Amino acid sequence: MFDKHTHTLIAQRLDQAEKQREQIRAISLDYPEITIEDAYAVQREWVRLKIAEGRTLKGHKIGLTSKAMQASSQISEPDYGALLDDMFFHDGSDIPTDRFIVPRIEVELAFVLAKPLRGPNCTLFDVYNATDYVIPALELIDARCHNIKVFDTISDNAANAGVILGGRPIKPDELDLRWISALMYRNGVIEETGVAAGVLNHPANGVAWLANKLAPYDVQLEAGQIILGGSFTRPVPARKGDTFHVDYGNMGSISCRFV
Amino acid sequence: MFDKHTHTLIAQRLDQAEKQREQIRAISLDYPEITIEDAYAVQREWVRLKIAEGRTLKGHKIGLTSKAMQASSQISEPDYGALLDDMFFHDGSDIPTDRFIVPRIEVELAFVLAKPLRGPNCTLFDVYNATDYVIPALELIDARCHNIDPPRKVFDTISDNAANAGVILGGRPIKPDELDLRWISALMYRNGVIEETGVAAGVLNHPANGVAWLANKLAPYDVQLEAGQIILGGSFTRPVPARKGDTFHVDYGNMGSISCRFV
Amino acid sequence: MFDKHTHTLIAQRLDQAEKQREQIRAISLDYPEITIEDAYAVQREWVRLKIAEGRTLKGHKIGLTSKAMQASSQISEPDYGALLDDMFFHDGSDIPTDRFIVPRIEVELAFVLAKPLRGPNCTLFDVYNATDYVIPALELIDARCHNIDPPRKVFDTISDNAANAGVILGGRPIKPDELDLRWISALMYRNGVIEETGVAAGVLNHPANGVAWLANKLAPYDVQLEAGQIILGGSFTRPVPARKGDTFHVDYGNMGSISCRFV
Amino acid sequence: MFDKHTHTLIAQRLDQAEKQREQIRAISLDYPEITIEDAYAVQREWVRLKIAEGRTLKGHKIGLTSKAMQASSQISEPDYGALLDDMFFHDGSDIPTDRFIVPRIEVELAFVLAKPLRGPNCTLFDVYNATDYVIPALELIDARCHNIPRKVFDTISDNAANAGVILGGRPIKPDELDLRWISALMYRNGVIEETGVAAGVLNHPANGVAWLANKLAPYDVQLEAGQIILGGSFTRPVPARKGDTFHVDYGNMGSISCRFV
């Protein structure tokens, strides 16, 4: 583990990259010995910096869930990152393309917590008990590091950039979350489809997993937090002028336009 | 009734207007005493020309259904027009904006006929018996006459093949007896925002009614609605302008969706 | 921001306009530099007067939801107004046409609160948690300022208590988690004919959204949405003029109906 | 256009590539002037040769459906190929891995025809009228050409990458449920590798069947009663390796499984 000052330095470079819309060199190429522990430390530092700047923690995401599951990927488990208030866009919003560098849209479910969730022994059942509503959610992911590597993604707040909630809120017991499915349209054509079971076999699993990862840091998932569980589609690039419409069937839809 | 030659020449000017994407003056201003029968005669001549050029009749539309019903509108009954093969786009198509003048999208249901329908006494029941499937349909409408003289009337619309330009089918095909057609409803999004919503009962109290009306209108001309034709029943939303770069997505709930992009 | 005294006097003129059923000139024409905050201040003063006369606050409405969403409209966000006890009519009422100036009917859903809602960070989820029942609601809207100067702006509407005049509740009360509120749909009949149709998602993509927005708007004024209040979420149809002798019947399908007659 | 005897020579090379499980150079590289018409002519010849050897035509498939839709791909419309009887494996079967070169599994719906479909004006509604049953279907695809935009000519010539078909799950009448929302989870060796929803196939998985009838009409060919028509995959293909077990869960449409040996 690098010393605190190195983590802060890396975080400040990611911050400037995000604000300037100018990518930096992959952190792992400049810091060949970086570990996963370092990457989460850098993330913590960046998030700390951004909250100091006037942002507020609103929740967390779990990512690389598809890659953790795929036999072909060397990724062995999910990543996580922190969701801040300024990342949220309303359903039907115009999204400022110029804010982002290489934005892509992916399709998720979100858990809105009525009660806190704390590890180390958090289960799926705890998640069900603590969840007020499940709601469809799009994630807008981005990269502050050049991709000419998991350590780079994690350092870079797990690729976080935007979240768009919409559709129909449901109580968790209302229907089988595993069979929620979606069609992602971009510019009028279906680009990806998927089913929620594709997220770790049950889209609530990542929420328990996450609570358990945060416990050693004396961190819990707080009541009121929104937790994105992971994408069940591949991400699709968003370019200026693109309209997205994601149809979750009887769970409603989420749309936006890049301007 | 003007002579056949006058009908043919008005038809030719509409045809050139469409081909050139350049509007003509409202027919009703150049011909102040034009009748409804003249307007349909001009339409018949234009469709004749188009078919002579190699186009094929695929069905018909019923239009001005909302206005026929609205008390604030002087329109007393629907109009109709002919749908040709080159008007049809598949769900999820890029539509060439340059092909059109002032295109607008509206939200309809279509009836695909298994059997022919002939007037003069066609009923809603006949329509049910003859219909193979009901399917969501968008209509792309346009205007080859100026709307404000450099306003248009019903005679201009009817002459102008009832504003026909495009049709986009999509969604879930259903047998007519599968659910209550009156309560099919839709949300019309453009560029990610809902611009209009509507329910199918807004078309003449039952979206199948215009099909019987249409078969009855065509009966005097020794024309029927043929097996295999697609009949668009009328829009249950107001039309929404389509501009280059616009994406539309029309969500018919459990009846599926229809989308396209103007390029 | 004009002084309190100016706000009070504009409020008094609206009040007289309502009492006399005689419109005043558009406030926005007499006060060319009026701000949104001025307009809400005038509304606050008018509601204060009305409550001092013996009226009681029963809830609020969110308005201009369609226009806030429509790309062709310069309105960037909804408005709001205060609902008073004397605005409410029961389902199946005779409504005195003479009480109003240019009344119009529109089609909404209402949220009956079990618990209070306070901003600044109210979400859709908070609205669900606080809502006791959702119920169909018609709004009767009116205008105490002239629409064409012998046009009105948003400042006139907002000052004019957001065009509030009447509310008519009816139909089936449901718990918010009972069905998808987005797909509640309605047919608005007047005199036996369907004049408008609509679907509830046409209100801000989800009819509960305006309730959170409203709680957030009121938070700076140290005002919250109280337990027991009725909150009208915005119309999903265009408004339809109401004239003496008109019957309305608004069919919300499996959510019931609301009807009335203007006498 | 190449002369017909060149179509025949290309088809013979593909036939040998398949038999020896050894890829040939991309046809589009060996034959730079190749047209889509040539590609389908090569396919027709190869299918004729296989039938002459004792195979029987059992149906057709429509492919490249995702690529035709996706903006990131220059492919403009789907392709099609012929399904022969020796391509079909039973639900729960061992599949001989050694018979294939670079096999991959994908997830489809199939339409079992009660009545023939003939173009050139075939519609989705004609497909519904002509379909006896819709049934889940896996396709096993493969490539007899090595892959170092005109690649489409190679895929088409190579019988649209056809190799195998595995039918299973629940047979339904076409009006039973909305086919657009049929969904599936593709497991390989116990883990979900892909998921997808059938509307990913041309916005309605029946659409390609009408398009296919219309493509075949100029050749005096129709889709015949009794044929099985695979509509196109709504998942990306997943490599199949010796030892692999696949289990594809279509929810209330049942499942299809197989094992590579």
Ligand SMILES: O=C([O-])C(=O)[O-]
């Ligand atoms: O990485 C992610 O954000 C994901 O997989 O959803």
Ligand SMILES: O=C([O-])C(=O)[O-]
């Ligand atoms: O005029 C029309 O086409 C209509 O109302 O649908």
Ligand SMILES: O=C([O-])C(=O)[O-]
């Ligand atoms: O302005 C209003 O009252 C509305 O939109 O419902």
Ligand SMILES: O=C([O-])C(=O)[O-]
């Ligand atoms: O090419 C294929 O076979 C497909 O897309 O299903």
Ligand SMILES: [Mg+2]
């Ligand atoms: Mg994600």
Ligand SMILES: [Mg+2]
């Ligand atoms: Mg129409």
Ligand SMILES: [Mg+2]
């Ligand atoms: Mg209202």
Ligand SMILES: [Mg+2]
């Ligand atoms: Mg295939």
